[PDB]
Design a binder for this molecule. Structure first.
Ligand SMILES: Cc1cc2nc3c(=O)[nH]c(=O)nc-3n(C[C@H](O)[C@H](O)[C@H](O)COP(=O)(O)O)c2cc1C
Ligand SMILES: Cc1cc2nc3c(=O)[nH]c(=O)nc-3n(C[C@H](O)[C@H](O)[C@H](O)COP(=O)(O)O)c2cc1C
Ligand SMILES: Cc1cc2nc3c(=O)[nH]c(=O)nc-3n(C[C@H](O)[C@H](O)[C@H](O)COP(=O)(O)O)c2cc1C
Ligand SMILES: Cc1cc2nc3c(=O)[nH]c(=O)nc-3n(C[C@H](O)[C@H](O)[C@H](O)COP(=O)(O)O)c2cc1C
Lengths: 197, 197, 197, 197
């Protein structure tokens, strides 16, 4: 019933993917969805310099995560891991861990690169952290038919939606990438409501 | 409701574990639980010359997997991957993958090693394959309190149950190892019924 | 000084990538390079049916691997792992392992998908096995400039060269993919000769 | 010739390990070995209120890494990843990455956990980031005979040395753990000189 899209984005790609994930989840009758971001970690001046890019979404507290039946995580990659900011966040979830606050909750993840390299490693290495919390890990497999389209460069994997930002940052999530993101949101919100309800 | 425990074992360590997993699964009302092994790959002469171990469990067909709501997979490690016989078996699931036969079904893995090294990577890189079928991956987290006991050597991870066989093979699964295994069976069977049901 | 390109290919993509890897290695003055394949695992009739595709390269024995200063491994993916055939092969390397035959030798890997999904997981999960043998693992990082080209669909990652076969198998390794493959071969053969010499 | 031991430690477990790694590295003639820590990320008030542990080691700058031939990285796990402070630090290596400053340099990782769970994944997902800089990743395999001893609880994997801290933090690195650590330092220092030299 309650789905949190929790994300970090520096230049807006993950933010755009997050809104798409939220759209899809919102299609599920019975699903309350909220979008939030993790605290920034680099100093604000440097940030801004930098820089990229102010966000509407409120910053989440670690404690809030207990209020949700499913959490969908988005990070850009940093050399094939989650971003330091998302890492710093998850590192504050000890209290939650000790009480088993997130145990058995649905977790899914989406990311952004690149150039594309690391997009898989970023997701799967995020899953690891989620597993330590005993979260139920939900990949998207091959239901989104766009994953078979190799006629255009295209993010997205069976592990979760992804987007390709361009080495430059100038690319925007394509319709096909967004379509997969939307599918991710709808699927996990559906499974959440099936659970949940 | 239908939970399959599908395993490979050469010397019976995983076999003992599978039984424990099935034991746990059977504590759940409404869970039909069945235990099957994958085909041995080495010619019967070499197996006997190195062995045993002869197994009671029926051998599974790839097609069968479609008939279950949840599948719990066990393998000894081979240098930090699933065994070649588990790999060979899963390589036969192309038909299933193409029709979406395992999509959304619950999956969980347990393994056995050495010595211990590679026990995590075995579970984690098995998850990868399950994610390609779009299976919902279920880790065990730290519900099983035995995971905190560092006073004796002990298999078991938040990713799934493990056992430590010894360089010899001479170790047997300890009470704590089997306790975690039972837990893994009990939990995914419960989820399976909650899904499913 | 001695570089083995060890591969499995069913429909020729990895075979084509392997020859490219070999080309690149062959550019290194002082580098003896040989190309071999691992035994087929599926029955020959079925194979052929199937089927795809007869190879010039001789099939390697596990023992031979000790004769080399560097081994470059190629597999197609099977749901984000190495192929069962490559797995079966590596599973025969126990004797080598026990003597430390491959300890400290250079290892690198390249793969084929898809559609693209699993290309990273396939490489990194192969690295695991190589690490159990204490092989020195060599990724290619971002030296091959083609990795920045997002204007055409393109395999290859910092983990190792890859190729995209098309869901169909109809794609052929593109010039850019081959160029990265060639770079992989030249780089690890270079490092081999630096070692070696 | 120049080997950097670069680590994060909150309670000193990794710190003790780093010293052991440096100890091992120093047995190699021609190896200049230096030990540095990454910046603490939590404000000094919270650190003190939870701590210590105050560290003798100089704090490293991202830029410095360019000055070394080999870098050995240590981190406590955070739910199966590198720590957020190690992540934050490596996220500052963009300049290095862009100029190819760490390309081809030797890399190796060691960690610390719990409890044990996530010790492999921590090393393995650190490798991912190193591979993006095109570092030559060096696992330890099974040269260190202590890796066979399952008669006492014991950190250490073929991917790199580990120590088990206890749920308490109250465990100290055991003689065998440190022995593996020393080995890891000794081996990568030797390779570094062989490269380098
Ligand atoms: C230091 C750091 C490391 C990065 N490493 C990679 C990586 O090696 N592979 C890649 O494709 N992109 C890499 N990038 C790019 C980011 O993943 C990319 O800019 C991000 O997807 C942008 O998404 P956002 O707008 O949501 O912040 C890196 C960026 C930074 C700042
Ligand atoms: C080819 C092969 C590779 C192996 N690699 C490892 C490994 O690197 N790490 C480890 O701890 N044990 C390793 N082992 C030990 C097996 O994982 C062990 O015998 C198995 O867990 C026993 O399970 P079973 O009795 O159910 O067959 C290996 C064994 C074989 C034959
Ligand atoms: C059963 C099996 C599983 C496969 N799984 C995947 C995977 O899910 N992702 C993907 O992109 N391709 C997958 N494929 C495609 C193979 O990786 C692909 O056909 C191979 O790269 C062809 O290379 P080759 O000509 O060297 O054999 C799979 C193929 C088989 C037969
Ligand atoms: C936020 C956080 C997450 C942690 N996650 C794990 C983990 O899941 N598994 C584990 O065994 N220990 C975990 N621990 C324990 C730390 O890894 C342990 O305290 C560390 O290894 C001690 O090393 P140090 O003394 O060098 O700081 C965690 C600790 C913190 C604070």
């Amino acid at each position: 019933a309650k789905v949190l899209v929790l994300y970090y984005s520096m230049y807006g790609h993950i933010e755009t993917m997050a809104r798409a994930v939220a759209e899809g989840a919102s299609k599920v009758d019975g699903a309350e969805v909220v979008v939030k971001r993790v605290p920034e970690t680099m100093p604000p001046q440097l940030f801004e310099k930098a820089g990229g890019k102010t966000q509407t979404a409120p910053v989440a507290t670690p404690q809030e995560l207990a209020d949700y039946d499913a959490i969908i995580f988005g990070t850009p990659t940093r050399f094939g891991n989650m971003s330091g900011q998302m890492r710093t966040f998850l590192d504050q979830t000890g209290g939650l861990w000790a009480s088993g606050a997130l145990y058995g909750k649905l977790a899914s993840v989406f990311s952004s690169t690149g150039t594309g390299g690391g997009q898989e490693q970023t997701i799967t290495s995020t899953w690891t952290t989620l597993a330590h919390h005993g979260m139920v890990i939900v990949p998207i497999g091959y239901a989104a038919q766009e994953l078979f389209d190799v006629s255009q460069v295209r993010g997205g994997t069976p592990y979760g939606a992804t987007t390709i930002a361009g080495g430059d940052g100038s690319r925007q999530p394509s319709q096909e990438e967004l379509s997969i993101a939307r599918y991710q949101g709808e699927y996990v919100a559906g499974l959440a409501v099936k659970l949940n309800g």
